[PDB]
Design a protein around this ligand. Sequence first.
Ligand SMILES: *Cc1c(COP(=O)(O)O)cnc(C)c1O
Ligand SMILES: *Cc1c(COP(=O)(O)O)cnc(C)c1O
Lengths: 595, 606
Amino acid sequence: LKDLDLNALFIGDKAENGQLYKDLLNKLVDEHLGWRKNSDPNMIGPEDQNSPAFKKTVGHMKTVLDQLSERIRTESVPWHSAGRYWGHMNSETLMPALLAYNYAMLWNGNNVAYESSPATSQMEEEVGQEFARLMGYDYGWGHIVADGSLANLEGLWYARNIKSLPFAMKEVNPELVAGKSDWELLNMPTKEIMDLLENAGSQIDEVKKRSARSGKNLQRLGKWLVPQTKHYSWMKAADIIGIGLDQVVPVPIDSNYRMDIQALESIIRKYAAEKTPILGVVGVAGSTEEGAVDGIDKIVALRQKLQKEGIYFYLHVDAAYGGYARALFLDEDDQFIPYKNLQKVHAENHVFTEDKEYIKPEVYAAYKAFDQAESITIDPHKMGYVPYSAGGIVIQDIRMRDTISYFLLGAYILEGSKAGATAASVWAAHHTLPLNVTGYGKLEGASIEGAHRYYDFLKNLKFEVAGKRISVHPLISPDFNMVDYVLKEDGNDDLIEMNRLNHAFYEQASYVKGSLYGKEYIVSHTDFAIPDYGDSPLAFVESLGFSEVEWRHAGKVTIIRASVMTPYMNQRENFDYFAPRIKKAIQADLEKVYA
Amino acid sequence: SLKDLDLNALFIGDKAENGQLYKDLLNKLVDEHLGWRKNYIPSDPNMIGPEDQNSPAFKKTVGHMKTVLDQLSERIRTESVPWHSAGRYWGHMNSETLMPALLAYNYAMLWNGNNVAYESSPATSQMEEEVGQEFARLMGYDYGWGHIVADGSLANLEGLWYARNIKSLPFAMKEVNPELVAGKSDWELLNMPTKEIMDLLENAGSQIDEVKKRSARSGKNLQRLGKWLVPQTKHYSWMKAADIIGIGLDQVVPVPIDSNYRMDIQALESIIRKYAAEKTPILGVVGVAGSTEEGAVDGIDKIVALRQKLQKEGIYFYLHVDAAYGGYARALFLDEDDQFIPYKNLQKVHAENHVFTEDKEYIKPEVYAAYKAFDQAESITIDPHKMGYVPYSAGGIVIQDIRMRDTISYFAGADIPALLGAYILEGSKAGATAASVWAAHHTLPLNVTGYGKLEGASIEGAHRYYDFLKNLKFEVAGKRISVHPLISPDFNMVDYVLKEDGNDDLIEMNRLNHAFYEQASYVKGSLYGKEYIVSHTDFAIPDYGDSPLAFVESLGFSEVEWRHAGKVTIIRASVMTPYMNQRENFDYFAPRIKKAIQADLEKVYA
Ligand SMILES: *Cc1c(COP(=O)(O)O)cnc(C)c1O
Ligand SMILES: *Cc1c(COP(=O)(O)O)cnc(C)c1O
């Protein structure tokens, strides 16, 4: 697939490939309709179709769809326009994923029961194998979940039930764990748990009855450690799963907005000295507001270190946003690419348009260590470009599914009924674009390169407006494809005024419901506030000349946010066209803020 | 209002009779979306041009995409179960969905909005809010709310998350501010009616956040919250729900069902009293409206009356109605202004709105009484993708009082949430799913003018099937074989057994019905159309207790036989098609079904 052309796989910002989409859709719908036809005799005949009541019912249906159409066309946000839109959301999806959904949903199969939908059931089995291969799990498994928040919950459900198994085994058959103290039982590695459970053989059902599934001993299972900026799905997941919000422990992040691994170790050692177990740790690959990648490799090394002293924790990687990026690192046979060969393999497969370093070494090392996590959340509906709703969960060892199972897919998942059409959509996206450099690598690469062009363009911007001098100050070089920055009046050390400036700028560079005048530059915004960030933004705000005192008084810094998900800005010629226009739009927006 | 609505026009059709209408409307919708991307906000220039489209690499990539779609297309067509044809298919699944629901999904998916945050997709967010208001009005809630859930198992989990959190709130208030609940013993605090808990919480005012912090959200006090009582045949989503939500499997208590396969309310009361006498609370009770294998409708009215009785003795329990299957059937009892129809006006209103083609009694009085009492439940599960005829995947949950949502909410008057995602159990959710349900509900209002007709047509078809089965006799290989319907249907599921006359071996009757099922079913790769297709299931003692004893005894089996076999195999039908309500249509298939049953029995015995 060396010459795979991404331009052919999307409808396009201006529906440039609309006719292709229509042609393929009509062909697939014809195939379904032919299939229903190809017996007797017609429940609905030409006598029915011609009646006055039938035609009036058709008219009624058409009126409701016209009302639907009106609302969606006039209340939706203007469609994203590459080169102008530098905000946090993307709605564009892979055309083969849209088509496959459109076709499959005509069968209306339900993937909880193989019977109702054998082909999409098999497609979900294949997608789960494809996730496991992406993450480097030789004996793993995965499935499609309604969304990544529920995948996170499923992750905690595994961790919770797994932690509780050693004691459950002791209750059912003390010889399975003979000689182990309670602190050893609370610090058994997950592989050793699954090997014991396998040895328990026929007693697995009784063992499961005495596990956390029984509701007993939940608080004993210990602390769930997350970065302080965790997505709120994690707080909900601890609430829902019964360990509770009291057991969630925030771990400080560093100046790169990554979980501070020295602080992680200090927290873990302090709980372990009290004999409080660590239920698990969440590492994030692709944070929600900075696209930061945590040092998953540093967490795995820390765990190996602590295992020597009798301490173990479950590791879950929340890669809801960053999951598909592991495709950058896998060759056409799905093998992990050595770091020194990376630029060469990328150049050969046209992942990046220029041959330079694009991936930070510590980002590479973090992604390399995924295969050591017990479980991973990944969302086709984010950076997989599959339409909502489609989340995903990957587990390291397929035997883990027996810890949550009920008495095939339906027996092994948190949720109930699910659309076979969803599996068709994800399956079609994966087979059009393999999960390595030949497929998704190119798509994730185009996004990263457009984020780098944008980042490079923003670091040298100054504006003269209403007698004042304003500079752009990028937050950090992006780990992935999110780029953040602040505007600031030169020499002005009032953080509250800087906050007000970025907020007002955002209001000038954003649409409102009903907007029809196109804007040349659209951004997003968010606040980094002390309650979720602590002092992680302090070095940045001090670098700008604000004092620590000023930080505590304002209590937050307002940040202009961009998640670069369009593939079109990777090309120098495309980006260069918009760069001078963006600069003119920022200048006019500042004129309006100060007027 | 909509008196002449013709249901035939709202489906693609078993033989794709309306396939061209579907394709025409789909193509109009797609052109409207494509014209919107191009022109709603005119811009220059195009990122993809004719010089890109005509390059060899582009054409080759199109070729590769067509190959993948051709592969998908083949696998689904060659592996799928043959499409179900009304009059031939009498089994437990339906795949036919409303055409406006399908078209609306197809169209809205092109924008790909996410309904977790309003700002992201305001039109579909507004549609989901209106759908929630529609669910509330359907269930008779004066100030309730609802929303679409990924599926009905997760809606039941959400139900339990509400009951768990609400139960824990009076203790959390005690812990944060003892004056709020001064003078109430612990047993009182664990038996406060939900509305009284919500009023106290509103009074907590500025301390609400601290109180939620100390509630079951914290992970503290879960085991003090009490038992979750469900009918013995519960959908497994409940055992699973208890495990997930942290109260544990050990807190689920099965309540015996009666000979109608409804929860036995005398046994419910006895269990509750038992627990109360030892000061164990009841976390809540699940009433099923439309059981999975019999379509039975539990006496929700009798549960409500019991709870009013027990409240005089200081006992309260949360009530959740699982109407995953039977939720939309409430539209049978609502007039065009959405008011509940009195029972004695029901046949008249149904005749005026053409809900049933013959003027007879279809709705049992105890079924009417049960649906009327839905508005007294704290929460209700309802699945648009079952009897709503909306495509998978779309579940629903309705809550009796909008204020309840503040007990489970997060922030990261009762107007539309800015982050729906903060009032719900799940996370990201397709705006296309809200569009699809919205379009269904506006094409077919949730009352006699709309869904009443569709739920009615299903019910009337189930009754025709029931009446046909009731006196069916066959002569095969010298033996005399009768059909024995389980019970007259509460809703639209119809169950029966075949039995050799005079033979008392329940094991043999079981083996007859299994073999019959194997003859009247498809296998993967079936191309010969069958005249008759059925489903089957076992009523086994672990799940059913002695509920089927009266029935098997009415056939001539002994209690001892029952215990030896430990189960009775049942032939099952969920009559979901709308086409069998008409006499004409059904009468055409009746002799053909009878012929097919005779031929199937001949093969069984050969
Ligand atoms: C968006 C997101 C989630 C939740 O995923 P949904 O699919 O939106 O439910 C979890 N974690 C992170 C890091 C995310 O960005
Ligand atoms: C099917 C069903 C459920 C589960 O709903 P799904 O949408 O299939 O997850 C719950 N309760 C009852 C009574 C059911 O029939």
